[PDB]
Design an enzyme around this catalytic site. Sequence first.
Site, PDB file in Angstrom:
ATOM      1  N   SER A   1       8.049  -3.713  -5.517  1.00  0.00           N
ATOM      2  CA  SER A   1       7.351  -3.828  -6.863  1.00  0.00           C
ATOM      3  C   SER A   1       6.813  -5.034  -7.125  1.00  0.00           C
ATOM      4  CB  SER A   1       8.325  -3.376  -7.974  1.00  0.00           C
ATOM      5  OG  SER A   1       7.678  -3.170  -9.148  1.00  0.00           O
TER       6      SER A   1
ATOM      7  N   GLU B   1       5.987   7.420  -8.025  1.00  0.00           N
ATOM      8  CA  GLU B   1       5.692   6.190  -8.705  1.00  0.00           C
ATOM      9  C   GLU B   1       5.447   5.909  -9.933  1.00  0.00           C
ATOM     10  OE1 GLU B   1       6.404   3.526  -6.788  1.00  0.00           O
ATOM     11  OE2 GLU B   1       5.555   3.601  -4.769  1.00  0.00           O
TER      12      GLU B   1
ATOM     13  N   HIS C   1      10.365   5.439  -8.564  1.00  0.00           N
ATOM     14  CA  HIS C   1      10.055   4.023  -8.136  1.00  0.00           C
ATOM     15  C   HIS C   1      11.059   3.396  -8.348  1.00  0.00           C
ATOM     16  CE1 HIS C   1       7.019   0.419  -8.365  1.00  0.00           C
ATOM     17  NE2 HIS C   1       8.155   0.031  -9.240  1.00  0.00           N
TER      18      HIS C   1
END
EC number: 3.1.1.7
Lengths: 526, 526
Positions: free
Chosen positions: A197, A324, A437
């Site tokens: 991320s 995600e 995610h």
Amino acid sequence: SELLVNTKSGKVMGTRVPVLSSHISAFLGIPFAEPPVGNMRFRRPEPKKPWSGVWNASTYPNNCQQYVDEQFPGFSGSEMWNPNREMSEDCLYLNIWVPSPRPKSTTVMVWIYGGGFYSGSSTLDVYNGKYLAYTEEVVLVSLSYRVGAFGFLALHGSQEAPGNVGLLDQRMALQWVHDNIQFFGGDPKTVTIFGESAGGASVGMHILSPGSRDLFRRAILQSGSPNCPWASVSVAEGRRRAVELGRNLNCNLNSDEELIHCLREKKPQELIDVEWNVLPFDSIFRFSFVPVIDGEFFPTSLESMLNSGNFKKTQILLGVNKDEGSFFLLYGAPGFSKDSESKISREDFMSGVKLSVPHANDLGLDAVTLQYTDWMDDNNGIKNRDGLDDIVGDHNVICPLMHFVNKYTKFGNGTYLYFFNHRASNLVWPEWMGVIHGYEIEFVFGLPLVKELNYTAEEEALSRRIMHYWATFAKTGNPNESKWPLFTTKEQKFIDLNTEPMKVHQRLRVQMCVFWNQFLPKLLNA
Amino acid sequence: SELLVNTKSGKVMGTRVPVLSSHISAFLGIPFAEPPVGNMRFRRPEPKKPWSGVWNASTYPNNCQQYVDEQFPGFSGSEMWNPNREMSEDCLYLNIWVPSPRPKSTTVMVWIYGGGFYSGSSTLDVYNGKYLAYTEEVVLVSLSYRVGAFGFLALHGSQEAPGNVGLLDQRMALQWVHDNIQFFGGDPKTVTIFGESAGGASVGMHILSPGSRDLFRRAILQSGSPNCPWASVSVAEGRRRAVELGRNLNCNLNSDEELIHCLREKKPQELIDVEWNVLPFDSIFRFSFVPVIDGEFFPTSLESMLNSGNFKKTQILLGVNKDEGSFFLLYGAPGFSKDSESKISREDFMSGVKLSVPHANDLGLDAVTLQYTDWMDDNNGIKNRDGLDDIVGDHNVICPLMHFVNKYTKFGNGTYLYFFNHRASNLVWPEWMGVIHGYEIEFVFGLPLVKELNYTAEEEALSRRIMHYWATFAKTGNPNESKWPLFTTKEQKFIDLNTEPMKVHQRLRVQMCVFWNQFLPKLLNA
């Protein structure tokens, strides 16, 4: 003596932690920079003065000051990511997990955490470096960096607060890893920086910044790429949010000096409290203080850079998660809730999409809708649910990473791309969030290995297989000890990563990304 | 006496034609309007004065004046559609094929031919009404209409040449069918008008025009719908092309009167010769003289009409072909040729797409390209070939028919929709053209039945099955004597029509048509 290590900084005494079968060495919270406290707030990091005596390194460092997620008080699914050690401005430490007996020259892995740049901790349970250090006999280091205003306030012309102070910190940790991991068993000529991320975008930013290129061999970027829309701001924009934060605290906005003085004197939490009030729009997956494209850390525009091969050409391993968007919907869009299947009404859908593409004009929202709507079932709430997840996802994570891979493989020395689509048998989040995610990180760190966390044997399987792909690539430049194809601009092969016999596929979300990467942008400029 | 029929117009003596097993009656070239020759050119049709004596009707009428396709001299694939009887301005006739013995009140079918409105013949071999008349015991009539300048010059304010003179002719034939088919065995309360391409759009236009609504029970529209882009022009536009034709013949363009005088005196062929020089663009599937939206034949805008259910509500059977674009590419786009697999270069592709969407601006061509390009194989010539076929097709035939079906089923009394995707085992055209636009007509008219034309038994099968779906619907309002689902705005069921056990499918080209029907238009108006 196993645990007492002499580094050019000074002597460090580790701790012996238990791990699965054996035992291992762990050196916790080693300084690598001087505390960015006092007049030093917002200022680029200074290297840590050498110490005398033995630095005790058997307890984790404080976490940097940051936003604490109070949304699901007690819910581990959400707490699992919050600071677990006291937050403090004195937080730039690094942690090392060494096989035992201590290796002589072994691959080093440097984990760089995500948190959209306003959060992160190198001390979280799921980032616990020991199953990886032990399983793969690898030196695992996990660095810390300044997140939020603290790490990213960008008042461009100033020395007191230029951007990317938190990226420079990433780099200092890298320099020290560079300069002393040999004293731990680490082969400095083979350190792979990995991250997720903002962790993954930061990795990508070190591949791009001339300053960092030389400090690491190769990279792994998971669910992030430096060209993500939420990963960098123009210096203008950074300026804007800077003074605006200035306002929320009733600061003298006449000079940067004036401004910086003020902020410099507010208690940490005061910055944290108004931090979300400076974003320019109502949007999901947009963070306030993030890397600024200043012309120092980044010579030019990331696009011109990718475009010209103006970047470290090494071999990278990257990929994405199946769902995600979910996290960002859950918390930001109306209609989604933790305890219901969050079926969304077109009313909700349309507000949702406006949140996701904050910069898109009307014709722009029209194009987004055209692409993600069923048309034969345009009010099917599950479908509206799922397609919004696809928007947030493709738009913010999958498409930018696919653009980054595609440009990069034109000049890199190998690309490996996966698609993680495995829903932990024990996930605590609603099934509708799917493959969330951040939910691969536990596989990557081999939690499915500890029998007391309740995974399935086939997940112990995968964690082992994931960890080996990650370490074999780290030390070798190829994940392969069956064959995980190399990403090639030609054929564009990738693999799904789940508990079933591996399938190679092609062109990950091509249809969709031709939309975000090529069609939308063109539309948005008349 | 079998063959001598008294109609309110006069006595008509038919001919006895052989058909498969039996024999049948055929009344050929019965006048239904007065010859639109002399000062009557461009003028709305007058009903045919009653005759005395017996009208001999055993030989086919002349074909109307029209463009003759010289492209593949001798090639039947192309000749099969050209006039086969002498062309003449005196061409408004009708043909009737009656079962024998003569029925008492039996379903009537009125075929209305295509030819993009500049061509057509009711006398072509593939339109030979006898296998249908015989197999299904149905009264088959095939009318004629003025095509080209002759049938469609639109000088809006004038009585000498208003639009849709060729549609009015369609209608007069319908009136006569109305008034005398009872004398042939036809049940005037059950005449279904069927047609293809401009034949199919014309059908759709009679469902829409208050004047025609009452003259037919139900309809079949194959590969055409009145909202096709190439099926009607604004009166302004019609005016423009009218004078422009005026120019190519060095006519006095001061008054419509002046203008019409000129044209009225040019030999037919002189109009034919310059006919293609007035289109406003370089485009594929655009015809010069076509129905004008005058406010008489069409009260308002076809869109306002469809929109408000301002149309005959009966039950219609309609559908499309798999490769509708091919013909138009072959003849109009650079790169396609009859004797090569016509693999197209992006250079050719881009010119191709500009030809197909003549009204689209740059951003418009950009959107078209985005949608029909592979992106992972953007120079794969087969793919560029095939996707251009998809453009011409979806854009000009599939999407407008899907818009027409969708609006219409909101107020109709049943919809049946098929997708013809069968490549005649004997097609003479290059395999790359696929299921060519107009290649179902032979199934519909049961040619696969005559053993000397070389079809396969499974095509004899299908022709029989097609013909029965068509006649059972004609007389009953439902194709069903297994079940061919009803098109429902809800579920949107349709069937593939080929030699295999019928599959019901849903939402025909939904993804693509949301693009043409909704996204493109919106884009094209800022």
